[PDB]
Ligand binder design. Structure first.
Ligand SMILES: *[C@@H]1O[C@H](CO)[C@@H](O[C@@H]2O[C@H](CO)[C@@H](O[C@@H]3O[C@H](CO)[C@@H](O)[C@H](O)[C@@H]3O)[C@H](O)[C@H]2NC(C)=O)[C@H](O)[C@H]1NC(C)=O
Lengths: 462, 132, 132, 132, 53, 52
């Protein structure tokens, strides 16, 4: 018998497409004040519903590197960031000639700062006073060709001037749930063996994503998510030496960082009422800001990333080497800690090798034996390109700690030579897209195509 | 059976399964097409997109002449070149997610054939009611 | 009589009165649900939200299968535990404003029962049309 | 003939021509009413105008009781004072663009007469179904 | 200047208490108590409806 | 330069706040005559202002 086109609506069909996603966060952030933290104000309260339903019979191709959503998150974070620093004090009376004093205390591995005295426009806008504040050395540059070694400038004012972050907002990596808008859905890969591209032959659907951490971290991934069953490696094309390679861990490697220096928050007044906060005296002994990792656990994790690198490079041992060098913010492990922003020299970590056979750490001599990283600290931060490219992070008065978890590494293959048996990987992951790309690896947005036409034996009654 | 009654298949639980079952529970794919609440200009732009796209899908479904507007038959014959596949193969063996790949090459012609046939039916029905 | 013809009861003039009279003039409560013009982002959100809430109320009335869709009967039996009250008491004596307090405890179940029953009826009607 | 099938008359190609031909191809004037994508706040406001005004036009066509709702007859008599013109003159000779100037003086009364008549029909049909 | 910077009112705007009608958006309504004896809380047993205040 | 139908501009030298906010240097730039106005009732023909 003859077949006539019969139309069905409410039809499960997809198109991968670009869409503007919500921002959603947990309910506990919404009893706070405005923009403390931003998720309280710039995002909707979340809902656990729907459940993580599983579409058992499905097969779908996913991607990360052509994925639009990581770039959309980057734009969202940048735009929110400009919105967040808009109301804060603009500074610009700090680029006065800073006169910074020398010191008789011996230099070395102690991270000595410069005591810089400078003129300020007090609350009486057309009157001035001398004021002193201590700045870290990376924040400070010698003045000009009219050379005087005792006179200095902030590292800005060779650049667009900079804005202090208000203390009323704190930059904790609050979890952020991204949710597809109504009429779209998010498909979540359920197969733990996903290697960055290709078909996930078992997928789940959710309206909202995991509580993604908007974490700022360069060479290592901090407080991130974890793989279910095995350590994972991800890259758009491992053939290229230029492309970043992400590593995602099964278990976390604990990292603890701290300032042993006991800063006191000075409160300088700059013009009409607005205050500029700066480091006062170091009430206590001068000590080195640093980071720590349990040495045996780092060795185990690095050798296991070695076995996972061997799956893509079977005929070679793996060597790890010092970072790329050059710019301070690129070569060093820059990350956020409590309000201060550390810059760590990770050459002490990436110095081991995998021999092709696991070297036993069992029995352990001391599980609390630690490898130490000695970290610089900056207040003037050039975070991103096109964000206004500047923050002054005010100092917070205490010997702080930010005990946290590593869950991923951003390596990079060095230039090949001789087809060597030991060709090396360096930490060079600079862009913060990769941090969220290492955490949004399960997800893709689908546009519902709910209007389908199919044949069957029926024609409209007339 | 697929006549669950207390249907719970979320947004897309019928995807992948056979079209014989996905013919039922179309309502969950249709009911869920509106939701969300405020965040500024960007989320408002997202929200208006959902409403406008839904109304577009209702335009197409309305000018085609459906009664009980989530399934309806039509008088336009299935020109076999659109599939060249057996009815039982389409409905029992295969799934909607796969059927998208077959018919999507030809949808824009059907979307006008249904329109003109429905408008013809409307005029003819008014004429018949006048003659009655 | 409530069949005024030139009905003038504004937004809500049937509220409070007996449900027998409020059964008519439902249109003024339905006709008035869209209006307004723009001021800035804050009230543009109000304008969009009215449209979205209306379309949600139409989703519910659409997937339930109403024809002439502001009153429609259904095939789902009234499980008496939902009211345990006489029909004449409900329609003649009571009012819609009070009736909200009775049924609102149980609405979410009915809103799915009507959905599944309507979709069942849709497939069954297509099958009967095919057999015809 | 006006039954083109592959209708191509754009937004308004039936305008000016005789109402007998414009009675067909109403769908192109109806299908096109929603379109566009986003820029800024101003054209986002422009986008919402299409959505809200369309839904208003659907409110009017819905509470009047149309089935196959782009043409529907009604039971309200044409009080001849509304046109005092011959049927053949209206349909064959005149055009919709000109006919707007005639009826627009009196539309607001018809827009309520259809509403009340449709509500009367809805209640009467429920009563008849109850008696059946 | 023991306080944030302060701004002059432009003479082009005048701060007269112009009447403002607050109106509910479409799909909502404002109920207005008709009983003059209302004491700030509790049932008004006689109410009127208006879209604008 | 000799005046005439040549559209000669005015070479104006002025103090600027350099990258150092509270330090200054003398800087020169040439402005077209319509952009420039004599200073004020405290008259000096060698001192000028932008037309804003
Ligand atoms: C500023 O530095 C002082 C030390 O000079 C910090 O106080 C000390 O912090 C340690 C943390 O390891 C405390 O030890 C113990 O830590 C274990 C974790 O293994 C915990 O389970 C124990 O209950 C205990 O907390 C130590 O008691 C504490 N005090 C002293 C005198 O050593 C201080 O925390 C630093 N400032 C901040 C803000 O953290």
């Amino acid at each position: 018998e003859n077949l006539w086109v019969t139309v069905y609506y409410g039809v499960p069909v997809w198109k991968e497409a670009k869409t503007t996603l919500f921002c959603a966060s947990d309910a506990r952030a919404y009893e706070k004040e405005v923009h403390n933290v931003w998720a309280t104000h710039a995002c909707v309260p979340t809902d656990p519903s729907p459940q993580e339903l599983v579409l058992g019979n499905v097969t779908e191709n996913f991607n990360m590197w052509k994925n639009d959503m990581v770039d959309q998150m980057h734009e969202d974070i940048i735009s929110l960031w400009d919105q967040s620093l808009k109301p804060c004090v603009k500074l610009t009376p700090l680029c006065v000639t800073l006169i910074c004093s020398n010191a008789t205390v011996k230099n070395g591995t102690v991270e000595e700062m410069k005591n810089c005295s400078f003129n300020t426009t007090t609350e009486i806008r057309d009157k001035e006073k001398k004021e002193y504040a201590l700045f870290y050395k990376p924040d400070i540059v010698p003045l000009s060709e009219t050379n005087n070694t005792s006179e200095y400038r902030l590292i800005n004012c060779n650049t667009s001037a900079c804005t202090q972050a208000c203390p009323k907002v704190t930059f904790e990596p609050i979890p952020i749930h991204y949710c597809a808008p109504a009429g779209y859905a998010i498909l979540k890969c359920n197969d733990e063996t996903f290697n960055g591209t290709g078909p996930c032959s078992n997928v789940s659907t959710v309206q909202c994503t995991h509580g993604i951490r908007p974490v700022v971290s360069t060479q290592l991934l901090l407080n991130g998510s974890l793989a279910e069953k095995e350590i994972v490696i991800r890259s758009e094309n491992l053939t290229n030496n230029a492309k970043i390679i992400i590593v995602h861990l099964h278990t976390p490697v604990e990292i603890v960082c701290t300032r042993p220096n006991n800063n006191t928050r000075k409160s300088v007044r700059i013009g009409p009422g607005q205050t500029f906060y700066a480091t006062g005296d170091i009430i206590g002994d001068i000590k080195q800001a640093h980071c720590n990792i349990s040495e045996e656990k780092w060795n185990d994790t690095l050798q296991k990333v070695g076995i996972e690198l061997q799956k893509h490079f079977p005929n070679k041992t793996i060597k790890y080497n010092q970072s790329a060098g050059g710019d301070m913010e690129i070569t060093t492990h820059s990350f956020n800690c409590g309000g201060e922003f550390f810059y760590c020299n990770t050459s002490n970590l990436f110095n081991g090798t995998y021999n092709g056979t696991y070297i036993s750490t069992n029995s352990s001599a001391n599980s609390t034996s630690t490898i130490t990283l000695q970290c610089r600290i900056k207040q003037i931060i050039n975070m991103w390109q096109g964000v206004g490219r500047c923050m002054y992070a005010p100092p917070i008065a205490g010997n702080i700690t930010c005990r946290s978890n590593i869950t991923g590494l951003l390596l990079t293959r060095d230039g090949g030579t001789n087809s060597n048996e030991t060709e090396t990987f360096r930490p060079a992951g600079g862009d913060m897209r990769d941090n969220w790309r290492s955490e949004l690896y399960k997800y893709k947005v689908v546009k519902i195509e709910p209007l389908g036409v199919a044949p069957t034996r029926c024609k409209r009654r007339v | 059976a697929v006549g669950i009654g207390a249907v719970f298949l979320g947004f897309l639980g019928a995807a992948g399964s056979t079209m014989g079952a996905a013919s039922m529970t179309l309502t969950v794919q249709a009911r869920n097409l509106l939701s969300g609440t405020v965040w500024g200009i960007k989320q408002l732009q997202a929200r208006v997109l959902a409403v406008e796209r839904y109304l577009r899908d209702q335009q197409l479904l309305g000018i085609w002449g459906c009664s009980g507007k989530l399934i309806c038959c039509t008088n336009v014959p299935w020109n076999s070149s659109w599939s060249n596949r057996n009815l039982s193969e389409i409905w029992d063996n295969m799934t909607w997610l796969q059927w998208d790949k077959e018919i999507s090459n030809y949808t824009q012609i059907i979307y006008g054939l249904l329109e003109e046939s429905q408008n013809q039916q409307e005029k003819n029905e008014q004429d018949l009611l006048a003659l009655d």
